[PDB]
Ligand binder design. Structure first.
Ligand SMILES: *[C@@H](CC(=O)OCC)[C@H](C[C@@H]1CCNC1=O)NC(=O)[C@H](Cc1ccccc1)NC(=O)[C@@H](NC(=O)OCC1c2ccccc2-c2ccccc21)[C@@H](C)OC(C)(C)C
Ligand SMILES: *[C@@H](CC(=O)OCC)[C@H](C[C@@H]1CCNC1=O)NC(=O)[C@H](Cc1ccccc1)NC(=O)[C@@H](NC(=O)OCC1c2ccccc2-c2ccccc21)[C@@H](C)OC(C)(C)C
Lengths: 181, 181
């Protein structure tokens, strides 16, 4: 798991931030150019707090599948000059299952924390907070509030973003290459 | 830092537990035989909760130096049949400074979490919660309540146990080989 931690630490350092919306505090992962991702339930407005700074949101897309089923991801285009390091190469084309993953959080409640969550399984459909949701990845860890936007990784792979939990399992939305063109 | 995470994960799995005393919830590291360590301020009584179990404490020693100066460590002898894996080989004879360390926590507030804290420096004397305290190791991380008993490690080294913080820095008491005979 050493390499999985090592990759995760470098990825959070280069591409992650702490974001506040009206709906809470989240980890945010920048993907390429000025595009980043949040759990859909963060419900970013015209403005967000990004590491304490008011940042303008030029575009936001709540992702759904071809049937309109919720995927629980919102892509957002940031009004800022810096671009993110392009990490689309680390995103799979389809849901990845691994035996050992690391979930990385960066919030006030959990600043620079890394959790080895064990096996990730393609969970599939989940009734999440009452909304039918697809392309969930599941891991047996007691995830809690303050961990949404959590980045789920293994060595050289970004698997998904943490979006919910039932007190005993956690769930990430799979972060697929085609979401980013 | 990969190897430092890898060592830390294996060490917590084999030798750590979650302990409640009247004074809070702590990470506890077992050292050898039935001997473990807590921050002195956990103030373990005749009985502690060890992973939800009432466990008897046969002996407890609050460590002080040759002048009687506080070291902020309490060694405790547990009344249980299992012995800990002997990890005295990973303890230094004197305070270790490293460039990259991992602090590992295992509580309800922070179950199986690992934090890369950066450089550890021999801090020396510290007025901790009003008590003169020696042999502190310092790292620049915003440590919080719920992280005491936190185990500070680098590759193949157990450096100390987290005992306090000022909101911007954290401090571990050095865990020295001679404390354990
Ligand atoms: C992240 C928010 C954050 O960072 O805080 C800002 C400061 C947070 C993390 C999760 C909370 C608890 N565990 C976590 O990991 N995510 C949420 O709170 C998320 C919000 C949300 C998502 C989508 C729409 C609207 C809001 N909500 C939940 O995670 C949700 N849990 C849930 O839906 O559980 C699924 C269950 C399920 C599916 C199918 C069949 C049966 C069941 C079932 C049975 C019994 C319990 C759960 C489930 C919240 C609202 O939690 C409960 C469990 C109360 C529903
Ligand atoms: C661990 C407890 C835990 O797991 O909770 C159970 C559920 C906790 C972690 C630390 C809290 C905040 N940051 C942490 O990492 N440890 C303590 O609370 C610890 C308890 C204690 C230790 C020893 C005797 C009695 C109680 N207390 C503190 O960490 C303490 N901080 C402190 O003393 O700071 C040192 C400062 C210092 C030294 C020399 C010169 C000047 C200063 C200075 C100036 C200004 C601020 C701090 C210091 C607590 C009580 O915090 C404050 C900062 C309020 C004193």
């Amino acid at each position: 798991m050493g390499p999985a931690f090592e990759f995760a630490v470098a990825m959070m350092k280069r591409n992650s931030s702490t974001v506040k919306t009206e709906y809470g505090e989240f980890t945010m992962l920048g993907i390429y150019d000025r595009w980043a991702v949040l759990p859909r339930h963060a419900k970013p407005g015209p403005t967000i707090l990004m590491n304490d700074q008011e940042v303008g949101v030029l575009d936001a897309k709540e992702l759904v599948d071809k049937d309109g089923t919720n995927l629980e991801l919102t892509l957002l285009k940031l009004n800022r000059n810096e671009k993110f390091r392009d990490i689309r190469g680390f995103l799979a084309k389809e849901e990845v299952e691994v035996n050992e993953a690391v979930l990385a959080i960066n919030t006030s409640k959990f600043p620079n924390m890394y959790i080895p969550v064990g096996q990730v399984t393609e969970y599939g459909f989940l009734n999440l907070g009452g909304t039918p949701t697809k392309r969930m990845l599941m891991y047996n860890f007691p995830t809690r509030a303050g961990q949404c936007g959590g980045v789920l990784m293994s060595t050289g792979k970004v698997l998904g973003i943490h979006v919910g939990g039932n007190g005993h399992q956690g769930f990430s939305a799979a972060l697929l290459k085609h979401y980013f063109n």
